Amino acid sequence: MDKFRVQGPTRLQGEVTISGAKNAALPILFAALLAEEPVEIQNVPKLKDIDTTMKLLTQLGTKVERXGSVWIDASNVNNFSAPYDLVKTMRASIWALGPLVARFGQGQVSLPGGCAIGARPVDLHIFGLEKLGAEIKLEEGYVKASVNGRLKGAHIVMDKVSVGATVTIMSAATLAEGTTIIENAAREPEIVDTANFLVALGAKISGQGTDRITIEGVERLGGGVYRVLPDRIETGTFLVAAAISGGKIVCRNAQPDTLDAVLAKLREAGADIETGEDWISLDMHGKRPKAVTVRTAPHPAFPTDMQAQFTLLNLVAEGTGVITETIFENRFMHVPELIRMGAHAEIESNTVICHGVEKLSGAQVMATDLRASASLVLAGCIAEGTTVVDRIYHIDRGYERIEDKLRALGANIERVKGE
Amino acid sequence: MDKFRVQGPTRLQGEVTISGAKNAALPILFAALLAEEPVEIQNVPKLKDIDTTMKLLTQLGTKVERXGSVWIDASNVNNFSAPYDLVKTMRASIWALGPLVARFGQGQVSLPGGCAIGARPVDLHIFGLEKLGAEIKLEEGYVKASVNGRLKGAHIVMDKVSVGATVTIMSAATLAEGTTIIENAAREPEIVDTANFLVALGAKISGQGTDRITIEGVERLGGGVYRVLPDRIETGTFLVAAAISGGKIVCRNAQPDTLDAVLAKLREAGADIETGEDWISLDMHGKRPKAVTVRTAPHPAFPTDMQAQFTLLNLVAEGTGVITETIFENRFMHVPELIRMGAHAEIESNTVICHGVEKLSGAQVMATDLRASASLVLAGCIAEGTTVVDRIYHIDRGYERIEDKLRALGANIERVKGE
Amino acid sequence: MDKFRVQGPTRLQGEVTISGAKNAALPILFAALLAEEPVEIQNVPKLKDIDTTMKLLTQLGTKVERXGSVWIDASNVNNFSAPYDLVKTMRASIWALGPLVARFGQGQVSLPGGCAIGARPVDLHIFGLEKLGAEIKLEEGYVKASVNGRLKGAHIVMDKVSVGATVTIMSAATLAEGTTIIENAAREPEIVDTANFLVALGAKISGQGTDRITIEGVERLGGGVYRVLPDRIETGTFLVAAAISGGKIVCRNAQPDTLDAVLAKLREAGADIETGEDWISLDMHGKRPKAVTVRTAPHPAFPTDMQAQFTLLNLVAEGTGVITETIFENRFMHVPELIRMGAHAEIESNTVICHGVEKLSGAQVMATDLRASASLVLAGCIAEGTTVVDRIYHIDRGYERIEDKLRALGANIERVKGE
Amino acid sequence: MDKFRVQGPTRLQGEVTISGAKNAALPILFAALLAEEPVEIQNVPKLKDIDTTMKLLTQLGTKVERXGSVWIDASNVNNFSAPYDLVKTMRASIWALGPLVARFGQGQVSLPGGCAIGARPVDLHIFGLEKLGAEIKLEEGYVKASVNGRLKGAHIVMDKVSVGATVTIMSAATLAEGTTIIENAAREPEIVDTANFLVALGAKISGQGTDRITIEGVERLGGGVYRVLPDRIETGTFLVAAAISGGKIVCRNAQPDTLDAVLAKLREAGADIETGEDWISLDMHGKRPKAVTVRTAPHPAFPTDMQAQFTLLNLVAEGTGVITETIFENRFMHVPELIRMGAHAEIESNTVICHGVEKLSGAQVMATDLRASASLVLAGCIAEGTTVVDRIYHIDRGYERIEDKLRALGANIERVKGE
């Protein structure tokens, strides 16, 4: 079981290059199934899910190769079924369904053994495909969709806001006959990125990033070169790393505009921030951060994905600050871990009241949440002494070699083994 | 476009005989598709939906006759499809699905068109059936279900309480192989009645009325005689009629136990109430009702179907009353209509603050909801002058000759045809 | 009982000069109680609530005179009580409490007979004052606040975002000794305006408009001249008027920045929009608006106060649009009135599914809500025939002579006295 | 720092005598302040809060002593104030307030400060009292209540269901002039017990246990002997200890009727349960438990206080089961500890997905929650090996000598005196 052994305190400063967003790379990789011609996908991070997707794609008869880029040749897809062994570790695999049916007339995706019926994950996807004219075949453990000729554009009202189903519906709609309208579409920057990718292939989409996405179907999608957008959360994590260590950092390959709320929040903490079209700088001037008030909410408001990081900021800031999770429940599992590191906090209902302390103390900590986990690693960086973060495979799944990035920032960090 | 012209004030007093519950008769009529031997369903009301169901049954090859009872012989079911023409005006038609697949191995029901995905009623039916081993197809405007051989008992956890899917799952499970357990089952008296009916046929069911129903599959269901339970909302509607008019009333062919919360509310309003095995008496002793606080919630608690009726009550009651709706959104349409009759109230969020007035005044009113509509008719009876309740077809569909029942109570009411 | 007789259809086009916001004028008027030197408040609308506030102020011993401006001389305040009548027709009256205590050491405002313990508007104000060092005295219908000397700055965390309490705490905090931090402060443009007014008097306030307001108390506030900000919702009502009428309009005395979400929403409807330092232009180019998807949420997202207006827009737009209310409950009560005008709509849960039709048919209509009411007048302007909007006094409360404005835009409208 | 050491696995069987409910004892000791004659309170557990209450009472001038009983003589009560030195460590202190002002005409309770306002516990108590005619005086750090003569009966609508405020209102109302009615009253067995205590003193109360309590005020309360009801949660914890271990336990000095939901759930898990007037027997027959579906809700529904206990049950039961928590927000702290013990569980939103493993592994654990902690100790009992549960002082505060009880059941437990 891999662990991170950090030795602090250390000032995090310098430069970091931001990896592509896993959350944009995935839907785009599945969308490449629509491409009749070779496709080059740039800025694709080296992550477990990316590997799983490549295998899945190959299993369908797609020609796949990688490095920074992922080269895809789907001119000839022959197998329209995603098997159990291949979708078992990845829910995103459902993304193969829509492209398959829209372009080939048929698709089949294996489903896991479940328990409760009603409002499940796959649900929105299946019904979205059904509104598009797909015939659905359901049997415990799998979903099959098929259509005679082209899908038919339709007017769709989403009762629930779903990032997943929005990608599925928007993807399959690019080849449908007519216009498709999606009401209550997820607004995430990743949805915008996926739509832009499609448009680069010849798709006709508008409204991406708003509550209403409109798609005019076209006969076919071509090929090309496409650059995946920067990882916005990864970027936020690095900004916070400098903000909590009285450091100065510059983020390369970033996209300032996917972070309005986070940047504004950082300024409130007294951070000196600068942006360029593709870069972001943060300077504390050796100064300790000021506590802030945070209310997480749906994009483009302050993201829940930055929550753990900001809680950390408040925990070592000057003063008292409160963090409120307005949509999500039980998002504070990790606070007791920080408290064990010498933090002063109180979890109350859907909030965390933060009392800033001068210095943290290393400890043996652990968290299952990717973000919370990453925050523990940041804590280890500035705490007095030795910190050991257990089960970092969580971090490995969403961050492209964070230890190396942290090390170049001046961190004393080692990847160590353990029983 | 029928209307009720009412002239008040009139004290509502005397006797009324309660009709069988439409909502228990429907699921029961459908479940009869499982019976191998002739069956007699007693106490079935004469309502539009019953007619639509009989016709549906006839089309499936069922021999159907009616008067008070509805006679069914489904020994020779030979057709397995419920077409658009026969199910357009009736959601309940989905109930033919489970019995067909469980007994015959195949079944299909026409699905009315719709544009929203998620929250769709039929969703839970499909899922329960799939859990039981059925193959589900969403094609040709139809929802299709089939199984090779017998359904297979399963442990089903409902993500949401659904009266409809509880009935579908429960019904089909009686013929499945093995044991079926439904977690988070709807508790409604209509559900208990349907269960009791199944058992009378030879089914093995327990837990009906609680959140956990257990079904022991058997090889076949027989025939028999079964009496549909009384309409609790109808009973409550008549009780309130006397409670707001200073009257005394005896409800015949009623079932006290399905009305716990409503009876307790009536006592708080100051009503003198007595009960027997199959009757309920309410005596105002010539007195004006007292205001009460109402919080709707799932059965066995206060029913949302009695909400508009109780609002009416608070409106002519002594004091200030509070009505809180936790079940439906937008269930206050009756209020603006009532206010036009001289009532006083404020709608704040999901609650109505009632300022009881001594007397109501006649006016031209209209509500699309069944309960609110019957409430308007009641208000017409006690209001000074003439009231014209428009669009009464809503009431015709859910109440068995309400005008006749009201007249026998002392109401001055006439059905006007034209506009 | 005033009413509007409208003759349609008429293209609304031209110019309208936007009134100051009642919602910012009120808290500023109350805040003037802090000023030791005369104060000039410009751009104050002529509305009932302003009068009540004026009467209330005079009663305290304040020198008050009005026009476009309101002159206040709070140099000689001697009465410290807000009598029963003044507070009964106006919740805003609670705003006199804070300045009184903060400046004079004593204050008292009447209380309307209680309803349900816990969750009264007045409560948050009370607790905030207490946090500031004030002694509170209560009894059914009475609230006295007092302190010996200065109020004391405190760290206050709001468990409920409240526009009212934020104003109270902020206002009173300008005179306290020390720093006051308000966590979870309301973000409204009106809060920003009030804070700005305070700063113009010599107060030290930062963070206005964000989740955290920090006030540094000072010995005293002088006098000066302050211009109340433009009415954001009126501005929006006018923008919609043109947008639903194929017209072109220019809003003068406007503040584009308080309308981001509404402006971007208008662009989605197909509108051509330009903005300047103090104006906003909208041009439909003779075109019918496009159906939009709306989601009301906390400022700066889409304002629930623009809801009815947008529902109207979708009702006469090309296509279907769904308006989703995440704010209040029961916000669609006016829709039936629109249906009576020939509109096509379905109310489902917390949403309205709008099916735009080509033209509205005039009729006799009425809504109690301010916004929904104004929307009915807009409808009369574009409907074919004559429309009579009843009970327009509701409109008069938040709209400065709307009939004159509409007429100046080309509307055929008459204020018919009583009938 | 006290700790618990457990050697497992060990079948928990035999008998246990249930302690009196701390939660009933507390409000009852406070209500005794209303007694004009001596009172003997039986079956009071020996816990910290009881000691604090005793100290509090003595300081008011009450003659107090304890053993199994607590003897109260409120004849010389000459001091009407509860100082911070007491209430600081005990929230229930607010309970002295109502009896004080109701009997003596005056009462003052010290209040813990804090940043947060709105949604504060004590708010409902203040409001109820005010409804009864009391004058309220506030200042950060204290709440004072007084009245001229007797309190006055009033009709009170609880905005929210509050156990504390229900006791306060009910208690004070017993000496009020006239009739008091509490709408939306908390239903807890602890409230029923306090009402019964009051009635034995001569008060006039009814509806206790339902959502509506009626209190007819009387001149004065006498004295007597009264036995505190059994601790329902303690009994639940004991039943679970047997259910998760193939054992057979009989709970003595119990009250079956206070545990409906828990008993039904245990049967759901496959337990052979029998009950009598004052005993409860559970028999697993050496059998492992069956996973169950659990949804916490207000009494008489499933208790949140049995939550952690049931999760442990699931974690070692056959299959998958889901615990959904709707009362408290962050009540999942016990899960990560259980995982360390070899348990398979996924946390999702307000629910926990359990994966029944055959056996747990000894380990070093710690939970701050009274219930979660007790759960861990239970875990240690059946887990293979040695387990060390830290900070068992939480358990000490709510459970009367848990080790002796467990030891008598077959457990291998030792108290360890820290560091």
Residue of A nearest to D114 (CA): A353
CB D36 within 8 A of CB D223: yes
Please answer yes or no on whether A117 and B130 come within 8 Å at the CB atom: yes
Dihedral angle at the C-alpha atoms of D116, D117, D120, D125, nearest 10 degrees?
A: 140
* Same domain, residue pair B245 and B385: yes
C333 token code pair: 């009560």
Give the catalytic positions of A in this structure.
115
CB D208 within 8 A of CB D200: no
Task: Tally the residues of chain C.
Answer: 419
- Write out the H or E segment, with its range, that includes residue C359: none
Say how far apart CA B182 and CA B186 lie, in whole Å.
Answer: 9
Say how far apart CA A205 and CA B263 lie, in whole Å.
Answer: 58
DSSP SS3 for B258: helix
The dihedrals phi and psi of B137, each to the nearest 5 degrees, come to -125, 130
Closest CA to D354 of D380, D316, D381: D316
Please answer yes or no on whether D293 and B319 come within 8 Å at the CB atom: no
* Same domain, residue pair C140 and C177: yes
* Same domain, residue pair D215 and D163: yes
* Same domain, residue pair C175 and C264: no
* Same domain, residue pair A174 and A127: yes
Please answer yes or no on whether D137 and C136 come within 8 Å at the CB atom: yes
* The domain boundary residue, chosen from C179, C211, C228: C228
Beta bridge partners, D40, equal: D71, D225
Hey, how many other C-beta atoms are within 10 angstroms of the C-beta on A39?
28
Give the catalytic positions of C in this structure.
115
DSSP SS3 for A331: coil
Say how far apart CA D273 and CA D282 lie, in whole Å.
Answer: 5
Instruction: Name the one residue in this structure whose structure tokens are 């189903």.
Output: A165
CB proximity A306 to C under 8 Å: no
- The C-alpha angle with vertex D111 and arms to D106 and D113, in degrees rounded to 5, equals 155
DSSP SS3 for A254: coil
DSSP SS3 for A302: coil
D178 φψ region: left (φ > 0), alpha (ψ -120 to 50), beta (else): left
Of B115, B333, B350, the CB nearest to C329: B350
Say how far apart CA C146 and CA A378 lie, in whole Å.
Answer: 48
Hey, how many other C-beta atoms are within 10 angstroms of the C-beta on D286?
10
CB proximity A286 to D under 8 Å: no
Q: Is C162 annotated as a binding residue?
A: yes
Q: Is B187 annotated as a binding residue?
A: no
| Residue B108 to chain A, least CA–CA distance (Å) | 14
CB proximity A294 to C under 8 Å: yes
Instruction: Name the one residue in this structure whose structure tokens are 């006969």.
Output: A219
Q: Number of A to B CB contacts under 8 A, please give it.
A: 83
* Same domain, residue pair D330 and D373: yes
Looking at residue B291, the DSSP 8-state letter turns out to be: P
CB B60 within 8 A of CB B77: yes
* Same domain, residue pair B204 and B330: no
- Optimal mutation site among C161, C183, C262, C310, interface A, most CBs of chain A within 10 A: C183
Positions of E strands within C11-62: 14-17, 39-42
Beta bridge partners, C294, equal: C323
CB proximity C327 to A under 8 Å: no
Task: Tally the residues of chain A.
Answer: 419
The dihedrals phi and psi of C10, each to the nearest 5 degrees, come to -140, 130
- Write out the H or E segment, with its range, that includes residue D155: strand D155-158
* Letter string b/e over residues A64-93, b meaning 16 or more CB atoms within 10 A of that residue's CB: beeeebbbbbbeebeebbbeeebbeebebb
Neighboring chain D residues of A117 at a CB cutoff of 8 Å: none
Say how far apart CA D376 and CA B45 lie, in whole Å.
Answer: 57
CB A327 within 8 A of CB A296: yes
Neighboring chain D residues of B322 at a CB cutoff of 8 Å: 157, 183
Spatial CB neighbours of B207, under 8 Å, sequence gap ≥ 6: B185, B213, B214
Q: Is C22 annotated as a binding residue?
A: yes
Experimental technique used to determine this entry: X-ray
Closest CA to C243 of C301, C206, C187, C290: C290
Say how far apart CA B169 and CA B106 lie, in whole Å.
Answer: 15
- The C-alpha angle with vertex C205 and arms to C204 and C208, in degrees rounded to 5, equals 165
Of C116, C320, C329, the CB nearest to B329: C329
- Amino acid identity, residue A330? N
Q: Give how many domains chain C has, as a whole number.
A: 2
Positions of E strands within C30-148: 39-42, 63-66, 70-73, 81-82, 106-110, 116-117, 135-139, 142-146
Hey, how many other C-beta atoms are within 10 angstroms of the C-beta on A113?
8
- Amino acid identity, residue B409? L
* The domain boundary residue, chosen from B197, B228, B259: B228
Hey, how many other C-beta atoms are within 10 angstroms of the C-beta on C178?
15
| Residue C350 to chain B, least CA–CA distance (Å) | 6
Give the domain range for residue B165. 21-228
Omega prior to D189 cis, within 30 of 0: no
CB proximity D155 to C under 8 Å: no
- Write out the H or E segment, with its range, that includes residue C18: none
Neighboring chain B residues of C329 at a CB cutoff of 8 Å: 329-330, 349-350
CB D342 within 8 A of CB D8: no
* Same domain, residue pair B405 and B282: yes
| Residue C25 to chain B, least CA–CA distance (Å) | 25
Helix axes A232-243, A307-315, angle to 10 degrees: 0
A305: domain CATH number is 3.65.10.10
CB A144 within 8 A of CB A179: no
**What value does the CA radius of gyration of chain D take, rounded to a whole number of Å?**
22
Spatial CB neighbours of D159, under 8 Å, sequence gap ≥ 6: C116, C117, C118, C119, D124, D184
CB C362 within 8 A of CB C5: no
A399 token code pair: 């961050």
- Optimal mutation site among A91, A160, A330, A353, interface D, most CBs of chain D within 10 A: A330
| Residue C116 to chain D, least CA–CA distance (Å) | 5
Question: In angstroms, what CA-CA distances link D204 with B139, D181, D208, D215?
Answer: 66, 12, 11, 6
Say how far apart CA D131 and CA A44 lie, in whole Å.
Answer: 65
Please answer yes or no on whether B116 and A159 come within 8 Å at the CB atom: yes
| Residue B91 to chain A, least CA–CA distance (Å) | 19
* The domain boundary residue, chosen from D168, D193, D228: D228
Hey, how many other C-beta atoms are within 10 angstroms of the C-beta on B415?
11
Instruction: Name the one residue in this structure whose structure tokens are 């004393």.
Output: A412
* Selected residues 33-62 of chain B with any CB under 8 Å from a CB in chain A: none
* Same domain, residue pair C119 and C257: no
Q: Is C322 annotated as a binding residue?
A: no
Question: In angstroms, what CA-CA distances link D248 with B252, D17, D241, D284, D402?
Answer: 50, 14, 10, 6, 18
Question: In angstroms, what CA-CA distances link C239 with A20, A304, C201, C246, C333?
Answer: 41, 34, 34, 11, 23
Of A117, A128, A155, the CB nearest to B124: A117
Strand order from edge to edge, sheet including C294-296: C294-296, C320-325, C351-355, C344-348
CA A73 from chain centre, in angstroms, equals 25
Please answer yes or no on whether B293 and D157 come within 8 Å at the CB atom: yes
- Write out the H or E segment, with its range, that includes residue B7: strand B3-8
Say how far apart CA B258 and CA D404 lie, in whole Å.
Answer: 47
| Residue D183 to chain B, least CA–CA distance (Å) | 7
| Residue D270 to chain B, least CA–CA distance (Å) | 14
Say how far apart CA B325 and CA B312 lie, in whole Å.
Answer: 14
The dihedrals phi and psi of A157, each to the nearest 5 degrees, come to -110, 115
Question: In angstroms, what CA-CA distances link C119 with B345, C114, C122, D119, D167?
Answer: 19, 11, 9, 8, 19
* Same domain, residue pair B9 and B26: no
* Same domain, residue pair D135 and D235: no
* Same domain, residue pair D218 and D236: no
Say how far apart CA A238 and CA A378 lie, in whole Å.
Answer: 9
Please answer yes or no on whether D329 and A350 come within 8 Å at the CB atom: yes
CB proximity A350 to D under 8 Å: yes
DSSP SS3 for A259: coil
- The C-alpha angle with vertex C104 and arms to C101 and C108, in degrees rounded to 5, equals 50
Say how far apart CA C310 and CA C151 lie, in whole Å.
Answer: 45
B158 token code pair: 């409902």
C120 token code pair: 């009264």
C95 token code pair: 């705003």
Of B119, B320, B330, the CB nearest to C332: B330
| B381 has catalytic annotation | no
Q: Is A46 annotated as a binding residue?
A: no
Q: Which alpha helices (H) appear in B269-392, and where do they start and end? A: 307-315, 334-340, 370-382
Of D183, D293, D322, the CB nearest to B293: D183
CB A156 within 8 A of CB A214: no
* Selected residues 106-145 of chain C with any CB under 8 Å from a CB in chain B: 115-116
CB B198 within 8 A of CB B173: no
* Selected residues 357-396 of chain C with any CB under 8 Å from a CB in chain B: 368
Omega prior to B121 cis, within 30 of 0: no
Closest CA to A350 of A371, A327, A368: A327
